[PDB]
Design a protein around this ligand. Structure first.
Ligand SMILES: CCCCCCCCCCCCCCCCCC(=O)OC[C@H](COP(=O)([O-])OCC(O)COP(=O)([O-])OC[C@@H](COC(=O)CCCCCCCCCCCCCCCCC)OC(=O)CCCCCCCCCCCCCCCCC)OC(=O)CCCCCCCCCCCCCCCCC
Ligand SMILES: CCCCCCCCCCCCCCCCCC(=O)OC[C@H](COP(=O)(O)OCCN)OC(=O)CCCCCCCCCCCCCCCCC
Ligand SMILES: CCCCCCCCCCCCCC(=O)SCCNC(=O)CCNC(=O)[C@@H](O)C(C)(C)COP(=O)(O)O
Ligand code: SF4
Ligand code: SF4
Ligand code: SF4
Ligand code: SF4
Ligand code: FES
Ligand SMILES: [K+]
Ligand SMILES: [Zn+2]
Lengths: 96, 113, 263, 114, 360, 48, 208, 126, 95, 176
């Protein structure tokens, strides 16, 4: 930032870019090192009523794997999912 | 319209894709007729090969054939037909429609122990 | 045989008449949570942690005390069984002191473990907790009675197994306290076993106090030599030093108790 | 009792593979002492080869001795190709290790081990 | 001059990581993932966290997912700066190394402001993230993102149209698409060959279905198109970072199951249940229900996956770590046939290889 | 301070020439900074 | 169960169950179990004779096209008489899906090498030789990949200790890095962490 | 055929890389661990464990840490049955000894027995 | 509240000091034995006992969330003061 | 949703062919790269003057460990061994006993700083804010055992650094 305008013009010409609009060295624009004290929100389970743990027990709703075939018609052939949809070329910048 | 590139490296553009797919699908059905009828691999592969061969016989356009075979480029559809042919030739020699070669031990797939 | 058929979650089990609900659930490998029930003490039924739904019954039953009738389907994991367990754990933890770091029972606490397994993850108690005066019952049992949850395993051990009749409850309601009511010293030959069965850290070992912690201890199974009873023990060590001696359950010797010299 | 083999149907083919592996190690040892420039003799390295073969001489299972021949060929392949350094070749010769007490009495003197 | 055979001997950083995971709890085994792909720390944290959360049947809160995607793309910038600049440093272009490691240093300051460590943060945890963003962090991430496109522009000014750089990369390490699928390649190693596959599109995780970005697809399979794919993934990562900064929601940052994520210290010091849960999560740890998952993310080196096996206890029964560098360095011998000795260093460059994730 | 310098140059210390008996004229040391200035110098706070 | 519970994906669960039936009835010679987890992953537990017929099928069938080997793994479970569990993780880019092919072996039974199906496996099962001692027959170059060159034993077996049996130090007498029987200045402190209470009643095993 | 018949006893001691000192001098102990009497839960008494005999732990001269020379000091193996543990100990050449599983015997409980008319099993307090 | 053994070695707040015939003092030869000289058992005994008018008092150590977990101390015994189990601050019912 | 890097077919008219030939023979992109390097020659460098100028940190920073005290002189550590239970590298060794006034206090609090992975799980496991991982990173040694901290060294680090540690905790405890 402390560079003179001759060196700044030489530098912008040699790079081909405006280098003062986007400095890679940081100055007063960055955040303060001392901040106001935060006040963080609490989650949806901070309720005094209708908040039983069994109605939101994630780990105890996990079941053992459903054994589909165990060794102790004209049914359609299946795939593990539908086939993947073809990706669309970018409208933003396809390089085309 | 003569597609210039498939986009995939090493996968060259097929000049006549419909004739190649017809030859590959009829050759798959030729190999696949040598499998017993109670083998589910024969029934499922005859079913999907007849679907693909009917779609190839019912579409002159290459792009629309790509959109309704639903397998990407037409050359990787050709490659998957060749892969299915090689698989059927291997499945003849494996004979995997047979019963289970051996039961597992009693707690072989019991998790947790 | 005159075995009656009952159901634990639909699974049929043939039980002897007089068997409680908790033992019938034990027979299928389910362990109903408990604080006042102990299989070598008399049935108390006063912590209400074992409340379980019998289906087609609009009231949970104390499984430690209720005998099974023929044809019951014990729902050990239904929704109102779990609501009962969370409610009872909430009341057990309402007045309980935040002493888990400075408590010798931490890591091996029944109250901590089945708070984790059967109760809620948080608190609704926005009040002040009670604080109980400590007692002095000897050089073996450190007594911090704020941690007491009034399960009366003290009293049933001292009355029924040690045969002493010095422990009891004084007061009434939330002010009810466990102790001897006087400066009396509970020195039996079996006095340290009340350290074992107290589910909380209200009764702890005064020699073992603060020195170790259960997860870091190694558990060597071994034999008492202080008498010719041959009590089975756990010598729990830590980094090559003997930390304490616990009992092993052996039904034919020392059922799960040891003497104070052994301990 | 009917198991799947690895290379050998029985102990005869297995002993044949053991015998070919001993031949290959015996041929390799002077090249190993030369190119690693070891401070041992060819007699001493061949005695270490014989010691490593006679350590496993009690085995009567064809699959176990198949895997022992496989691991010996892996050791030899890592020695012919210079993949081991001098340190990995000389780890067979426990030179910096103090001799262990062998009788009851000196094991009683030095500590608690049986 | 020609390379007939390339035999990469590895294990020089095999440290037995995933046997050491078998004796430690899930929280305790989290910081091993910082040190596998040790330029892609929070991405491996995210992969392990998603594995554990998939086995736990819980989900992070939305703000945790947005923070994870934000720092995953900051991490992607870190790894592609390391990749491009050391790939150029080994060839000989030593100068954009130094030019880009100041932006790299500022992103390490972002890590240190959010966690306290410059590299191994242990910040993305199963349940969410460990701690909320400090006040003023997102403004500085905006001030970084506002300027980072010019840094990519001057990197690309040095290397891309340079004829010496093109002569080191244009016909080097050409991989066909079928061989790249057969050798188990992933990431740029697929997408340089024209394979339209990115896990943040196809099998999307935390909020990547809600951010909008493009996927750079190569056309020749060489070192040069993989270079251009990594430069354009820096571009698209800046795009995702802008969308994450604008769409960051309020709310909590851990899952509000105190049997999985530890409670706040204000309620740990006040509530009995929270002190019990704090105790048991920091001594025993939470129990994971028994099962084996394979959870994979699109790390900046490729598909980074965990095959994680729980037996019910609070410690993993097994934790296999699928890393992209293992398959890429297995494909090194095919990719270097018919090339030269100074081309093998470009092939070990274009395969972004970090031997912590190769050797574990 | 010099807030016109870029962030990293904007705060510095000129170490003493003698600390705890040691001649620190040429032997300056990063651990010579007391902890009350160590927040300010390492930019943990805005406040000296 | 909205905020904190992982939402169940029923469509993928149904599709993976149907495809698991499909694989189990195309290949009854080898498929022993088919299961789908609650987080919707398909496991095909097969006999070890069918490593090549199953994995080629999934690589080459037009409704499978699992053209990618993501990961190959062994798991040592010592209470099983076939203590090693070989786990293949496959990716179909066409059908956007993952499958898991699990099989078994012990120390002496060789598994057939899957390098002819997926070349990706060339190092992976080589790692399974180095870490577990599972031999792979018809492997191109089977040797150690991660352990040191003189290493004895297989480290990721669960009867193998955390530290080894030997450790290295430089010895100035022989001017050489040497291996000696391991001594630790501080023993690794074993923590018994498991709670004596049941955590997941859905996973309760029946008693004896 | 493609199968051979091996009637020999299963032994893999030459293949596991274990030094002979930690094969023929160690005593494996196969046991169900006793319930911790600090607690009433039984979820740790479900499985079989193979441990080894403890060796010397000494004081580190620098810090006082517990130094060991035993590699098998922290090795606890878990088995579903007793026979799996015995087969695994015999497979590895470890001389073992087996304790039997000690279950608690079925108790006879009655809440009404606390209030008997004539028996000693009355409670004097509640 | 440090003191010194007859060997001239400082005794820690734990009470650790090496014996005279212990060789391990040789580690401090030419160097120093580092002890902390602020013994906490002497510093907490300098705190005055807090007179309160209630029967049960709460203690969190001061600082709110910066202290220890808030515990509740009973003060019914007039023989003994009631000590915080974490911080060691002691309390007395003034009646 | 994707883009094609390097799929430009270059123009073959005499203008563009002469442009590419002038680039080949007259080295235009090489002068472009020289110009970018020359443009960095006249920028101010990013080099701070260590030891006199320090790298920026935050109050979350995880440096040298310290045991803290209450604002009465009593040490906060009540020997609960949560820090050594959560310690992913097992750097912490703790032995405890009741001291002469019956308080639950440690007699051994060792941290091996050469096992420590500096992840700060100990200071978030700690329920009384006793162990912290403070702000010091400039504590390199000439000897390995000078990084094997005992309780005396950690308490001295706490007494040394408390004026900074307490203000960092004051800055950050609302995020915890
Ligand atoms: C061409 C030959 C060099 C001519 C001087 C020169 O170009 O100075 C740089 C001067 C300042 O450039 P800048 O980078 O924009 O200034 C920013 C400074 O940070 C802003 O300046 P500053 O605030 O940093 O000022 C402090 C600086 C003041 O700067 C100088 O003293 C400049 C150097 C003078 C030599 O003084 C020092 O740092 C002490 C340096 C002492 C040694 C200098 C080298 C001696 C070489 C011979 C022995 O350049 C110009 O003014 C443009 C070029 C003019 C050339 C005119 C024809 C000759
Ligand atoms: C009878 C009496 C004479 C006996 C024979 C002596 C012959 C002459 C030798 C040179 C004079 C002796 C002193 C040498 C230096 C000792 C003092 C020293 O190092 O002071 C430290 C000071 C810088 O402090 P420092 O701590 O290093 O900096 C930290 C960063 N702030 O360091 C400095 O300020 C710089 C020190 C520079 C050293 C001297 C200059 C270089 C050597 C010149 C002579 C040799 C040249 C040979 C040809 C070289 C190739 C052309
Ligand atoms: C420099 C150091 C070099 C180190 C070299 C290490 C190589 C170690 C390779 C070890 C391979 C073996 O041990 S295979 C041996 C296993 N064979 C058996 O168990 C069957 C019994 N074998 C024998 O008795 C063998 O002596 C013979 C030669 C096959 C038959 O002899 P008997 O008849 O009379
Ligand atoms: S008795 Fe249990 S719940 Fe109560 S303070 Fe002690 S460890 Fe915590
Ligand atoms: S002190 Fe313990 S055993 Fe006695 S009544 Fe209270 S909780 Fe029960
Ligand atoms: S920072 Fe981590 S590794 Fe270091 S002592 Fe604390 S918990 Fe252990
Ligand atoms: S430092 Fe904290 S966590 Fe560690 S033992 Fe002391 S009080 Fe407990
Ligand atoms: S256990 Fe039945 S009520 Fe206490
Ligand atoms: K107790
Ligand atoms: Zn207090």
């Amino acid at each position: 930032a402390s560079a003179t305008r001759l060196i700044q013009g030489l530098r912008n010409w040699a790079s081909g870019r405006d280098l003062q609009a986007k400095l890679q060295l940081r100055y007063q624009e960055i955040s303060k090192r001392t901040q106001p004290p935060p006040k963080l929100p609490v989650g949806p389970s901070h309720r005094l009523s209708n908040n039983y743990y069994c109605a939101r027990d994630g780990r105890r709703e996990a079941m053992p794997p459903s054994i589909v075939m165990s060794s102790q018609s004209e049914k359609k052939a299946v795939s593990p999912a539908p086939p993947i949809k073809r990706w669309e070329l970018s409208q933003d910048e396809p390089y085309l | 319209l003569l597609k210039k590139t498939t986009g995939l490296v090493g996968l060259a553009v097929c000049e006549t894709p419909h004739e190649r797919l017809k030859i590959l699908y009829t050759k798959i059905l030729d190999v696949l007729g040598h499998i017993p009828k109670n083998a589910a691999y024969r029934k499922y592969t005859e079913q999907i090969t007849n679907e693909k061969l009917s779609i190839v016989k019912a579409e002159p356009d290459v792009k629309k054939l790509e959109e309704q075979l639903q397998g990407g480029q037409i050359e990787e559809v050709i490659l998957q037909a060749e892969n299915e042919l090689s698989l059927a030739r291997k499945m003849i020699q494996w004979k995997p429609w047979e019963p289970l070669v051996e039961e597992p031990p009693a707690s072989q797939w019991k998790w947790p122990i | 045989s005159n075995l009656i058929e009952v159901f634990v979650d639909g699974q049929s089990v043939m039980v002897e008449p007089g068997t409680t609900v908790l033992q019938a659930c034990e027979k299928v490998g389910m362990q109903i949570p408990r604080f006042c029930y102990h299989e070598r003490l008399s049935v108390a039924g006063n912590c209400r942690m074992c409340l379980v739904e019998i289906e087609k019954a609009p009231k949970v039953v104390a499984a430690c005390a209720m005998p099974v009738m023929k044809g019951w389907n014990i729902l050990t994991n239904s929704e109102k069984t779990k609501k009962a367990r969370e409610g009872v754990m909430e009341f057990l933890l309402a007045n309980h002191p935040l002493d888990c770091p400075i408590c010798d029972q931490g890591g091996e606490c029944d109250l901590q473990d089945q708070s984790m397994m059967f109760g809620s993850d948080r608190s609704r108690f926005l009040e002040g907790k009670r604080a109980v005066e400590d007692k002095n019952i000897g050089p073996l049992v450190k007594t911090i009675m704020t941690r007491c949850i009034q399960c009366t395993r003290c009293i049933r051990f001292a009355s029924e197994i040690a045969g002493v009749d010095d422990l009891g409850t004084t007061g009434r309601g939330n002010d009810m306290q466990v102790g001897t009511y006087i400066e009396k010293m509970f020195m039996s030959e079996l006095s340290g076993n009340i350290i074992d069965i107290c589910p909380v850290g209200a009764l702890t070992s005064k020699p073992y106090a603060f020195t170790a912690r259960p997860w870091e201890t190694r558990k060597t199974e071994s034999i008492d030599v202080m008498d010719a009873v041959g009590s089975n023990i756990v010598v729990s060590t830590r980094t090559g030093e003997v930390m304490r001696i616990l009992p092993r359950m052996h039904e034919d010797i020392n059922e799960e108790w040891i003497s104070d010299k052994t301990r | 009792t009917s198991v799947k083999p690895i290379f050998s149907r029985d102990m005869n083919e297995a002993k044949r593979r053991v015998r070919e592996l001993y031949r290959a190690w015996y041929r390799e040892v002077p090249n190993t002492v030369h190119l690693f420039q070891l401070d041992i003799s060819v007699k001493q390295g061949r005695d270490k080869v014989r010691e490593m073969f006679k350590k496993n001489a009690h085995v009567t299972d064809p699959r176990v001795v198949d895997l022992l021949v496989i691991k010996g060929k892996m050791e030899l392949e890592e020695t012919i190709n210079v993949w081991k350094q001098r340190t990995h070749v000389m780890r067979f010769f426990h030179e910096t290790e103090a001799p262990r007490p062998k009788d009851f009495l000196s094991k009683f003197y030095v500590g608690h081990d049986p | 001059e020609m390379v007939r055979k390339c035999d990469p001997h590895i294990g020089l950083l095999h440290r037995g990581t995933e046997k050491l995971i078998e004796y430690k709890t899930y929280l305790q085994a989290l910081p091993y993932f910082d040190r596998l792909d040790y330029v892609s720390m929070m991405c491996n944290e995210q992969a392990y966290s998603l594995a554990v959360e998939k086995l736990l049947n819980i989900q992070p809160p939305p703000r945790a997912q947005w923070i994870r995607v934000l720092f995953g793309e900051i991490t992607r910038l870190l790894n592609h700066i390391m990749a491009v600049t050391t790939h150029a440093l080994d060839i000989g272009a030593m100068t954009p190394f130094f030019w880009m490691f100041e932006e790299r240093e500022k992103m390490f300051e972002f890590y240190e402001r959010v966690s306290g460590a410059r590299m191994h943060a242990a910040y993305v945890r199963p349940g969410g993230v460990h701690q909320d963003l400090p006040l003023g962090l997102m403004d500085d991430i905006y001030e970084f993102s506002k300027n980072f496109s010019l840094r990519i522009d001057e990197l690309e000014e040095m290397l891309t149209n340079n004829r010496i750089w093109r002569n080191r990369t244009v016909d080097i390490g050409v991989v066909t698409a079928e061989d790249a699928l057969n050798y188990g390649f992933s990431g740029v190693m697929l997408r340089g060959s024209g394979i339209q596959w990115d896990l943040r599109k196809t099998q999307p995780y935390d909020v990547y279905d809600q951010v909008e970005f493009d996927v750079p697809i190569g056309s020749r399979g060489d070192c040069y198109d993989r270079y251009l794919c990594r430069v354009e993934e820096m571009r698209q990562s800046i795009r995702i970072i802008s969308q994450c900064l604008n769409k960051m929601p309020p709310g909590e940052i851990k899952v509000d199951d105190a049997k999985v994520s530890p409670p706040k210290r204000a309620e740990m010091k006040t509530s009995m249940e929270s002190l019990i849960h704090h105790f048991k999560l920091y001594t025993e740890g939470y129990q994971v229900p028994p099962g084996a998952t394979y959870t994979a993310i699109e790390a900046p080196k490729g598909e980074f996956g965990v095959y994680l096996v729980s037996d019910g206890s609070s410690r993993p029964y097994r934790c296999k770590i699928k890393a992209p560098g293992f398959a890429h360095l297995a494909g090194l011998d095919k990719m270097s046939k018919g090339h030269m000795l100074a081309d093998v260093v470009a092939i070990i460059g274009t395969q972004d290889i970090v031997f912590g994730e190769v050797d574990r | 301070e010099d807030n016109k310098q870029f962030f990293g140059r904007h705060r510095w210390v000129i170490y003493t020439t003698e600390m705890n008996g040691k001649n620190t004229f040429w032997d300056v040391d990063g651990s010579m900074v007391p902890p009350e200035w160590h927040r300010w110098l390492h930019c943990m706070t805005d406040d000296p | 169960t909205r905020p904190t519970v992982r939402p169940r994906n029923d469509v993928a669960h149904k599709q993976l169950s149907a495809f698991g039936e499909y694989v189990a009835e195309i290949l009854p010679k080898y498929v022993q179990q088919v299961q789908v987890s609650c987080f919707s992953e398909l496991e095909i537990c097969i006999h070890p004779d069918g490593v090549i017929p199953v994995l080629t099928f999934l690589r080459d069938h037009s409704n499978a096209q699992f053209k990618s080997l993501a990961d190959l793994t062994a798991v040592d479970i010592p209470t099983r008489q076939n203590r090693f569990e070989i786990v293949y993780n496959l990716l179909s880019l066409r059908f956007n899906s993952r499958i898991r092919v699990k099989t078994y072996t012990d120390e002496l039974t060789p598994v057939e090498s899957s390098v002819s199906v997926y070349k990706a496996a060339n190092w992976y099962e080589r790692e399974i030789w180095d870490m577990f001692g599972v031999f792979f027959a018809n492997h191109p170059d089977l040797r150690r990949i991660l352990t040191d060159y003189g290493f004895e034993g297989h480290p990721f077996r669960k009867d193998f200790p955390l530290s080894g049996y030997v450790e290295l130090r430089y010895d100035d007498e022989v001017k050489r890095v040497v291996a000696e029987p391991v001594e630790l200045a501080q023993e690794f402190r074993k923590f018994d962490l498991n709670s004596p209470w049941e955590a997941f009643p859905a996973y309760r095993q029946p008693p004896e | 055929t493609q199968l051979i018949t091996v009637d020999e006893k299963l032994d893999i001691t030459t293949l596991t890389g274990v030094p002979e000192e930690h094969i023929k001098t160690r005593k494996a102990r196969i046991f169900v661990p006793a319930r911790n009497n600090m607690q009433s839960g039984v979820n740790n008494t479900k499985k079989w464990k193979m441990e080894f005999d403890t060796r010397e732990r000494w004081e580190n001269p620098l810090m006082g840490w517990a130094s060991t020379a035993d590699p098998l000091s922290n090795l606890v193996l878990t088995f579903s049955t007793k026979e799996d543990a015995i087969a695994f100990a015999e497979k590895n050449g470890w001389s073992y000894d087996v304790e039997e599983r000690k279950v608690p015997k079925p108790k006879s409980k009655s809440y009404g027995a606390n209030f008997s008319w004539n028996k000693r099993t009355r409670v004097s307090t509640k | 509240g440090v003191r010194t053994s007859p060997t001239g070695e400082k005794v820690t707040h734990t009470g650790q000091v090496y014996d005279d015939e212990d060789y391990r003092r040789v580690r401090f030869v030419g160097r120093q034995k580092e002890v902390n000289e602020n013994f906490a058992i002497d510093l907490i005994a300098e705190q005055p006992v807090s007179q309160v008018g209630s029967r049960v008092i709460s203690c969190d150590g001061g600082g709110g969330a910066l202290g220890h977990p808030r515990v509740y101390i009973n003060l019914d015994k007039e023989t003994k003061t009631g000590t915080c189990g974490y911080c060691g601050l002691q309390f007395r019912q003034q009646h | 949703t994707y883009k094609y890097v390097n799929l430009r077919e270059p123009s073959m008219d005499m203008k563009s062919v002469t442009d590419r030939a002038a680039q080949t023979l007259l080295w235009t992109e090489l002068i472009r790269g020289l110009g970018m390097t020359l443009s960095y020659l006249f920028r101010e460098p990013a080099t701070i003057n260590y030891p006199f100028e320090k790298g920026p940190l935050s109050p979350r920073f995880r440096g040298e460990h310290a045991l803290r005290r209450y604002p009465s002189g009593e040490e906060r550590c009540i020997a609960c061994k949560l820090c050594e239970a959560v310690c992913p590298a097992q750097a912490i060794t703790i032995e405890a006993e009741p001291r002469a006034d019956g308080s639950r206090r440690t007699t051994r609090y060792d941290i091996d700083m050469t096992k420590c992975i500096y992840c700060g799980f100990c200071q978030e496991a700690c329920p009384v804010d006793a162990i912290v991982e403070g702000p010091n990173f400039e504590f390199s040694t000439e000897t390995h055992e000078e990084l094997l901290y005992n309780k005396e060294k950690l308490l001295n680090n706490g007494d040394k650094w408390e004026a900074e540690i307490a203000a960092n905790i004051q800055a950050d405890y609302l995020y915890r």
